[PDB]
Amino acid sequence: QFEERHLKFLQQLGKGNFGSVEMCRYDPLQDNTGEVVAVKKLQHSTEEHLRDFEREIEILKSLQHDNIVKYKGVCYSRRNLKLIMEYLPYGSLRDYLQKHKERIDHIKLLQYTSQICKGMEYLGTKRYIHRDLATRNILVENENRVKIGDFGLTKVLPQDKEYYKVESPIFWYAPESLTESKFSVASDVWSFGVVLYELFTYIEKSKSPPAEFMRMIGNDKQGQMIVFHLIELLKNNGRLPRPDGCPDEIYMIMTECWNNNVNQRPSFRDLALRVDQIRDNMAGGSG
Numbered sequence: 001q002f003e004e005r006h007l008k009f010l011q012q013l014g015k016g017n018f019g020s021v022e023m024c025r026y027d028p029l030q031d032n033t034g035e036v037v038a039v040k041k042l043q044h045s046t047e048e049h050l051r052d053f054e055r056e057i058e059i060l061k062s063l064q065h066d067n068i069v070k071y072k073g074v075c076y077s078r079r080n081l082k083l084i085m086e087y088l089p090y091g092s093l094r095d096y097l098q099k100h101k102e103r104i105d106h107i108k109l110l111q112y113t114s115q116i117c118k119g120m121e122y123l124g125t126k127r128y129i130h131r132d133l134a135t136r137n138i139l140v141e142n143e144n145r146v147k148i149g150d151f152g153l154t155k156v157l158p159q160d161k162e163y164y165k166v167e168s169p170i171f172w173y174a175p176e177s178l179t180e181s182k183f184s185v186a187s188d189v190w191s192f193g194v195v196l197y198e199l200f201t202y203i204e205k206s207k208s209p210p211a212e213f214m215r216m217i218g219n220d221k222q223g224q225m226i227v228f229h230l231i232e233l234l235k236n237n238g239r240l241p242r243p244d245g246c247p248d249e250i251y252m253i254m255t256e257c258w259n260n261n262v263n264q265r266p267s268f269r270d271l272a273l274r275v276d277q278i279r280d281n282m283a284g285g286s287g
């Protein structure tokens with residue numbers, strides 16, 4: 001779809017563990033008048049990583065939703081597969097919320113929450129598991145609209161099961177992901193609860209899930225024993241605390257998402273409805 005020669009690098013936007021995203025100018029008219037785009041490429045183009053990247057591209061191209069970053073096309077010349085997507089200039093929600101927190105009230109946080117929920121509801125209709133729902137993977141287009149911005153870990157559920165068994169962001173993981181490496185819509189709901197916690201702490205680093213969990217566990221632990229003591233903590237119903245200023249009903253949603261019983265966690269459809277109702281009530285539909 002895109003031609004390598006016209007694409008001009010401008011600046012790096014983000015770097016993951018296997019890919020990076022660049023800000024580039026696509027200029028088919030060679031007049032520098034072309035659109036600025038975001039370009040994802042692999043750091044190391046091994047056979048494994050390229051096969052994974054191809055499926056990620058297929059996943060994004062199949063998604064069309066207001067709250068999912070827009071696929072544009074692919075670009076290659078010989079092993080230089082790149083994914084072209086719409087550029088969102090406010091960057092990740094983490095940076096945005098940090099910079100603008102004093103101006104972002106709870107009604108606005110719930111607007112972002114609702115948009116994330118509806119994007120995930122849409123993902124569920126395709127039987128996709130995101131596996132990395134966290135504010136680092138949410139992008140901001142404008143002050144009224146966020147989009148799920150990265151799908152590098154997203155899996156398609158197999159046809160015989162409602163879960164996929166597969167360096168992990170352990171402080172966002174459901175207990176069965178930690179113990180059984182099992183990922184499902186329900187483990188995405190668990191991670192969504194952590195996202196809600198991130199939003200209502202305004203991405204303060206001292207209150208981040210890793211900082212909170214390590215204080216609860218003990219900083220003497222490293223690597224494997226961190227995971228062990230996190231599992232024991234969650235099994236014993238230890239949970240992240242209610243953020244300062246967070247309404248109790250919003251914390252209650254977090255804690256329902258963090259149920260150890262997978263079957264007890266809410267659906268994204270129900271989360272979107274409840275968040276929308278809370279937001280409307282807070283804005284003056286109930287006071």
Ligand SMILES: N#CC[C@H](C1CCCC1)n1cc(-c2ncnc3[nH]ccc23)cn1
Pocket residue numbers: 013014015016017019020021038069085086087088089091092136137138139148149150152
């Ligand atoms: N979301 C998310 C995180 C993702 C990083 C995580 C792995 C590659 C980079 N990332 C995407 C961007 C980005 N920024 C601005 N516009 C964009 N469009 C598509 C991705 C994108 C920046 N970092």
